[PDB]
């Protein structure tokens, strides 16, 4: 009958500089022979060709396809991706959402610490030097 495809992880949260691997799978019979990945944009969905910007990779087998995105970018990579599998009896699609965490959120306990140290030094240095 018609194929039924689903994502392994419906939502992921990776960071820039790394490489996200989204994967769809299916267990219908006949198996899904061909897979196609699209990135959702406003009013239109753009196909993801292998080798694009020397950073995209697609590895497809019967009923399973991995989308590798190298060098996560904060501007174009985050969003919604649709995987579509077309078996001889029809086709199906799944939606995966990808977010890119940056170094702003990554180096949070470094700035936090140095800010607290600065505040403490200023507080004590006014509380004693001139106030006391």
């Amino acid at each position, epitope marked *: 009958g018609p194929p039924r495809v689903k994502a392994v992880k419906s939502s*992921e949260h990776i960071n820039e500089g*790394e490489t996200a*691997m989204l994967v769809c799978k299916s267990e219908s019979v006949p198996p899904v022979t061909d897979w196609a990945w699209y990135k959702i944009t406003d009013s239109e969905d753009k196909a993801l060709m292998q080798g694009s910007e020397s950073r995209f990779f697609v590895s497809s*087998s*019967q009923g399973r396809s991995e989308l590798h995105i190298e060098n996560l970018n904060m501007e174009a990579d985050p969003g919604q991706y649709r995987c579509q599998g077309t078996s001889s009896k029809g086709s199906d699609q799944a939606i995966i959402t990808l977010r890119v965490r940056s170094h702003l959120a990554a180096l949070w306990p470094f700035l936090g610490i140095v800010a607290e140290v600065l505040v403490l030094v200023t507080i004590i240095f006014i509380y004693e030097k001139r106030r006391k």
Partner: antibody
Framework: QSVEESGGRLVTPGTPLTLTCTVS????????MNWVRQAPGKGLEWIGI?????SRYYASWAKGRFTISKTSTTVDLKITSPTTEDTATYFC?????????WGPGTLVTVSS | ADVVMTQTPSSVSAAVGGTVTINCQAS??????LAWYQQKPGQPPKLLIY???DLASGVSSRFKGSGSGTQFTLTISALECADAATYYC????????????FGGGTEVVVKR
């Protein structure tokens, strides 16, 4: 669905050597193939992988020391300069989700 | 940089019918892309669990993989004497960039 390695033997350090993994029951253009080695009484070392499209990726420690290629029915693994530290059993494995189908493995000994 | 897998403990024992757990720690976030293998002496490894939780085909329910991120854990229950073997974890998260390094191994000894 099964695979069978061949080409294991004794060789002198430096002499190149080519191992062959023959698949059976599926085409090499619809599945990737991994090459994994295991020294006597040690763990498994992942050597490399050849995808269906033909792209080949090798492990960090094994860059340059090996070479993977493939024909329509067999996958070949060439060792350019075997060392004494290269004696191990070599398995070929079909990559779908992890490595499901594995081969019996062939033993490669490098000694004088 | 290749992802390195830190499999602990090295050895684990339990009585017939008990339950064992094994933890694998990934050097970085690998999401749920960890496979577990059971290698008996001499024979080739056998895939037990893929995607960190899905059971392989024809595998008993006694094996249960759990975890995500960087921490994973395999658990066996009603330990039979046929479970004596070495178990290995393996990451396959974006192999083209981090490789698929294997774990150190976990010798499971049954206590009769």
């Amino acid at each position: 669905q099964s695979v069978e390695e061949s080409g294991g033997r004794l060789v002198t350090p430096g002499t190149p050597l080519t191992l062959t993994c023959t698949v059976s029951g599926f085409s090499l253009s619809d599945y990737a193939m991994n090459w994994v080695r295991q020294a006597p009484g040690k763990g498994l070392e992942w050597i490399g992988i050849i995808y269906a499209s033909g792209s080949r990726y090798y492990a960090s420690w094994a860059k340059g020391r090996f070479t993977i290629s493939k024909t329509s029915t067999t996958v070949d693994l060439k060792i350019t300069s075997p060392t004494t530290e290269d004696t191990a059993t070599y398995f070929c494995a079909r990559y779908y989700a992890g490595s499901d189908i594995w081969g019996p493995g062939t033993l490669v000994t490098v000694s004088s | 940089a290749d992802v390195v897998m830190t499999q602990t403990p090295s050895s684990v024992s339990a009585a017939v019918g008990g339950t064992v757990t094994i933890n694998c720690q990934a050097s970085q976030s690998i999401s749920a892309y960890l496979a577990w293998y059971q290698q008996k002496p001499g024979q080739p490894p056998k895939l037990l669990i893929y995607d960190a939780s899905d059971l392989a085909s024809g595998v008993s329910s006694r094996f249960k993989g759990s975890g995500s991120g960087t921490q994973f854990t395999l658990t066996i229950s009603a330990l039979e004497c046929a479970d004596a073997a070495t178990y290995y974890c393996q990451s396959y998260y974006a192999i083209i960039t981090y490789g698929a390094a294997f774990g150190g191994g976990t010798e499971v000894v049954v206590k009769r």
